[PDB]
Enzyme design. Structure first.
Site, short mmCIF file in Angstrom:
data_model
loop_
_atom_site.label_atom_id
_atom_site.label_comp_id
_atom_site.label_asym_id
_atom_site.label_seq_id
_atom_site.Cartn_x
_atom_site.Cartn_y
_atom_site.Cartn_z
N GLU A 1 5.44 58.53 -12.05
CA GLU A 1 5.13 59.56 -13.03
C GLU A 1 5.78 60.88 -12.62
O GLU A 1 6.59 60.93 -11.69
CB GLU A 1 3.61 59.69 -13.19
CG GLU A 1 3.04 58.69 -14.17
CD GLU A 1 3.74 58.75 -15.52
OE1 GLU A 1 3.78 59.85 -16.11
OE2 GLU A 1 4.25 57.72 -15.97
N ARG A 2 5.43 61.94 -13.34
CA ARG A 2 6.03 63.24 -13.10
C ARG A 2 5.40 63.92 -11.90
O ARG A 2 4.20 63.83 -11.67
CB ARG A 2 5.88 64.12 -14.34
CG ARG A 2 6.29 63.43 -15.62
CD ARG A 2 5.96 64.26 -16.83
NE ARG A 2 6.50 63.66 -18.04
CZ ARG A 2 5.84 62.80 -18.81
NH1 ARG A 2 4.60 62.45 -18.50
NH2 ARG A 2 6.41 62.30 -19.89
N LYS B 1 -2.06 59.90 -22.84
CA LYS B 1 -2.51 59.10 -21.70
C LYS B 1 -2.87 59.97 -20.50
O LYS B 1 -3.95 59.83 -19.92
CB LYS B 1 -1.45 58.08 -21.31
CG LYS B 1 -1.22 57.00 -22.35
CD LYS B 1 -0.30 55.93 -21.82
CE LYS B 1 0.96 56.51 -21.23
NZ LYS B 1 1.96 56.85 -22.27
#
Ligand SMILES: Nc1ncnc2c1ncn2[C@@H]1O[C@H](COP(=O)(O)OP(=O)(O)O)[C@@H](O)[C@H]1O
Ligand SMILES: Nc1ncnc2c1ncn2[C@@H]1O[C@H](COP(=O)(O)OP(=O)(O)O)[C@@H](O)[C@H]1O
Ligand SMILES: [Mg+2]
Ligand SMILES: [Mg+2]
Lengths: 50, 47, 469, 50, 469
Positions: free
Chosen positions: C186-187, C160
């Site tokens: 997210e990261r 993704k």
């Protein structure tokens, strides 16, 4: 629990050159049961790490 | 020999389908029961 | 005076009592203080519920570690506001509108509230214009839509983020309008990578970045998507020029709403989700849209929990999209990249009236061959390729070559294989796959179709193996 | 339990008794019903822990 | 007045109110009186929770049938204590420490509290010494540890108790130290059988037996393991000579803890077990250990509910052991005894540095052959062994012979088959399984490997069937 593991593991980082350039590498260990890699905590932690 | 062996394999696949369907129905019932346990546990925690 | 008082503190949820006549409206932002020197900060609390007897249940956007019950809570009188305008391009922002790129920047811009109603129904119009990317599988089987809604579904760790960076490379670099990227739960390593990579590609000056990451409490992860959406909505409704919106893991938004659900006093729904799953997802997803004459091309990553596509969150995300690229871990494990599932993915403009008769016919034949191969895989596993028909063996060879030719060396994947990326035009894709379906390459090995571009790369890799197209 | 007490009275008098329980599955289901009506949290197959 | 008063009676859990300033500590024993002369007794109540308003929630070790509200409760000021010393050898005790063999015996002994802290981390030391039993599958694939923790997992009726009795016969009879047996939630008939069998074998004079069995309230089944472990810890710390500890179904301890937690009104975890599942398991298991110079060799049976090895109770037990023997119902149905699963069982000393290079190599080759045989079970189930490659047919024949040769006629099995048991030295086991893996007995039928001892028995049965080694 996701917030638990994600805020624990997000503190492992490669810092910038202005902050010293230090590093914290992380090796979390997760034990699955019956090879069920798609349990709750396993899938939580797989989506956090690199 | 091929006719006999294929009849044997057909009976074996029949029995395997039967056992697998029994296991799948057990897992279906167990999933429904576990989901209901979690929903009712949350609802009783909030009550 | 008109000040509040902290009453209960349970994680991210804070109860606040106000005097009669001074109860803040729903979604108002409130300010509390944490004076402990190691954690001194100003908590922003979004009014979530009116509990009665002047109480109010709020969600905190920062961690409440160090908060004391009884401290003063100030009502700001409005919802969370973020800066809007041309000045947000080129900078990295918080979920609250604070600039991280340059602290203090944008404090005097125009500020828009992050809570809106979607456009009226009499302003919506279907979008049916193909957006060409250069990926064979996307161009052929899930053609994207100009001004439409695109999604990348997938389990944890399939393609993704790499695919959405690939699409930022392909669609946003030579783009003539504005880009908005929302990092939603997210990261932070990936956010820093994206920031640096946009800065080097000289495309950051046209992009506005809004990050709320995994280390944030659920309030930030709930509201960061609304903040970036408000910036994109300003670029759509006021500037009026061709916005691109990227949202990495919109699912996190939903997930954040389920982390505070039971703490807000809501009975849980089926799979542990909040009862208001589809309603919140709808009030958010219906703002991500193009109106008549005002285009927003949206591209969202959707996390599929535990690879289960029947999970309520992706199952109700599915209904908000014009094109969906679905990534499978079964395709990932075979080494095919991008790990697109060709039989589960779809697009509303994959229609003879839009893409043409040949495009549509080639796509349908590819899909039929892959479906027959999927049907035959079990027999091949147990009984072997020998107990199939000659037609079935022909189809199996064609299908293996097709499923390998759908893969591609991507520009954003050079960091994983060392091989540079490739762009393939859609006409070349259609003609190549028509040849594969007719069987013009049944003599080339299965490899030499794997991670290549068009037909010239096919010829080169075939001859490097000792073959000729 | 009624049948077992009737049998145990004889057993402790030196007699030999044979007790049959036509269905302990149905007793287990009746006890599960009683325990769910007492609002006790169930376990495997919604059966009580005891 | 400092005595208590019964307020609530919820099954075997009792709420007791005390005067202010006279609230008993946790784990303290209290005494209530049931005066219904048909059920007249003294209830021992163990303090579990401090509820507030001077209330205390206690667990009863006797059934509370006939307990009235308001009766007087006397605080003994200390926890449950069991007799310790040399005098406990040769006798049978309650969970409370009452001698059933001879009532009143051991009342003047030294008494130790059944609630201890585990040894300090600095006194702990790893144990890597092999305990040779004489069983082929155990000595080869899961070698046991002297001073370590062995467990036998299994479903209902797979042979956990027969294997406990086999290990008693093998280890405890030639044993030079003290042995302690804890019957926890098991059959009372089996307790009588073991009592008589140890009296006949002249082993009782070295063994201390503690029984809390299936017909006991969950408090007794939760505390009997602690009582027997207290006796074992006295033998370890105050004499220092090689204790043996057998525990039949520590899972019954877990299940009684779950019943109690339900009665105490706690929120249930997954499945239905107590939230404190792993915490109780760790508190109990960390006391069952060898310290530096002081050996306790543990031997626990662990019941697997509904044949589910992912059940939380066995799953949390797995991490406390040095050697685990898992009994499969698949292996049990084939008639192989002991019904050990060679692929699921393990040992921490199956390492070249502990058992040797040849032992380790033979074990690894046996495991590889058995795993390859397991990977083919679908093809063999549908089509048989006739469709495999020649490599795979050879491997499947060797694997059938290996899995029959892992069975053995046990000394504890003579009560079922009339056939006496056999002992095989580990060198003979290594040599025999090496010759099986290399293929020296490919011509010998599958039978003649079944329920025998060494290679001499293999030869004799092979020539009684018609073959030659
Ligand atoms: N097109 C590709 N080519 C080569 N490797 C890839 C490709 N896509 C993904 N990968 C590998 O698989 C991993 C998938 O990561 P990513 O898809 O970004 O995770 P997520 O889907 O959870 O965001 C990457 O780290 C990369 O190493
Ligand atoms: N080695 C063996 N040889 C023959 N029969 C056995 C053997 N082990 C167990 N059995 C049979 O299976 C039963 C298993 O009983 P038990 O050990 O109590 O089961 P569990 O595994 O539930 O503890 C025995 O009573 C006997 O009938
Ligand atoms: Mg990602
Ligand atoms: Mg048993």
């Amino acid at each position: 629990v996701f917030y638990l593991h994600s805020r624990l593991l997000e503190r492992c980082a490669k810092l910038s050159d202005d902050l010293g350039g230090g590093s914290l590498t992380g090796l979390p260990i997760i034990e699955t049961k019956a090879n069920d890699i798609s349990a709750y905590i396993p899938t939580n932690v797989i989506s956090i790490t690199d | 020999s091929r006719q006999r062996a294929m009849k044997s394999a057909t009976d074996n696949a029949d029995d395997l389908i039967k056992a697998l369907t029994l296991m799948a129905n057990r897992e279906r019932q167990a999933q429904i029961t576990q989901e209901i346990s979690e929903i009712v546990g949350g609802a009783n925690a909030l009550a | 005076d008109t000040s509040g008082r902290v009453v209960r503190v349970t994680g991210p949820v804070v109860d606040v009592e106000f005097p009669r006549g001074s109860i803040p409206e729903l979604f108002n932002a409130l300010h509390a203080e944490i004076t402990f020197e190691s954690l001194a900060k100003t908590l922003t609390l979004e009014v979530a519920q009116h509990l009665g007897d002047n109480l109010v249940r709020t969600i905190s956007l920062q961690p409440t570690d160090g908060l004391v019950r009884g401290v003063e809570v100030i009502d700001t009188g409005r919802s969370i506001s973020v800066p809007v305008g041309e000045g947000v391009k080129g900078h990295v922002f918080n979920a609250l509108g604070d600039c991280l790129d340059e602290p203090g920047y944008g404090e005097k811009f125009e500020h828009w509230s992050i809570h809106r109603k979607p456009p009226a129904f009499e302003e919506l119009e279907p979008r049916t214009e193909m957006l060409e990317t250069g990926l064979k599988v996307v161009d052929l089987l899930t053609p994207y839509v100009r001004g439409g809604k695109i999604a990348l579904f997938g389990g944890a760790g399939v393609g993704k983020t790499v695919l959405i960076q690939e699409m930022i490379n392909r669609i946003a670099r030579n783009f003539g309008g504005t880009s908005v990227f929302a990092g939603v739960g997210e990261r932070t390593r990936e956010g820093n990578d994206l920031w640096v990579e946009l800065a080097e590609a000289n495309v950051l000056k046209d992009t506005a970045l809004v990050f709320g990451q995994m280390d944030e409490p659920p309030g930030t992860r709930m509201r960061v998507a609304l903040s970036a959406l408000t910036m994109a909505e300003w670029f759509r409704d006021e500037q009026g020029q061709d916005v691109l919106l990227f949202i990495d893991n919109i699912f996190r938004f939903t997930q954040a709403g389920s982390e505070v659900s039971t703490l807000l006093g809501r009975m849980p729904s089926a799979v542990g989700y909040q009862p208001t799953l589809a309603d919140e997802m709808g009030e958010l997803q219906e703002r991500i849209t193009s109106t008549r004459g005002r285009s927003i091309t949206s591209m969202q990553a959707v996390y599929v929990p535990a690879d289960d596509y029947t999970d309520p969150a992706p199952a109700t995300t599915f209904a908000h999209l014009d094109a969906t690229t679905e990534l499978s871990r079964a395709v990932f494990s075979k080494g095919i990249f991008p790990a697109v599932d060709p039989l589960a993915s779809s697009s509303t403009i994959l229609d003879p009236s839009v893409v043409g008769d040949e495009h549509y016919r080639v796509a349908q034949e590819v899909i039929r061959i892959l479906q027959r191969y999927k049907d035959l895989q079990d027999i091949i596993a147990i009984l072997g390729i020998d107990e199939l028909s000659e037609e079935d063996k022909q189809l199996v060879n064609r299908a293996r070559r097709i499923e390998r030719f759908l893969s591609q060396n991507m520009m954003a994947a050079e960091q994983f294989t060392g091989q540079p990326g490739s762009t393939v035009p859609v006409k070349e894709t259609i003609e190549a796959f028509d040849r594969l379906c007719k069987g013009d390459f049944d003599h080339v090995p299965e490899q030499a179709f794997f991670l290549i571009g068009g037909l010239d790369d096919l010829a080169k890799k075939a001859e490097s193996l000792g073959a000729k197209l | 339990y009624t049948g077992s007490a009737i049998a145990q009275h004889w057993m402790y008098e030196g007699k030999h008794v044979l007790i049959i329980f036509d269905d302990l599955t149905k007793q287990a289901e009746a006890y599960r019903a009683i325990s769910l009506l007492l609002r006790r949290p169930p376990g495997r197959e919604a059966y009580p822990g005891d």
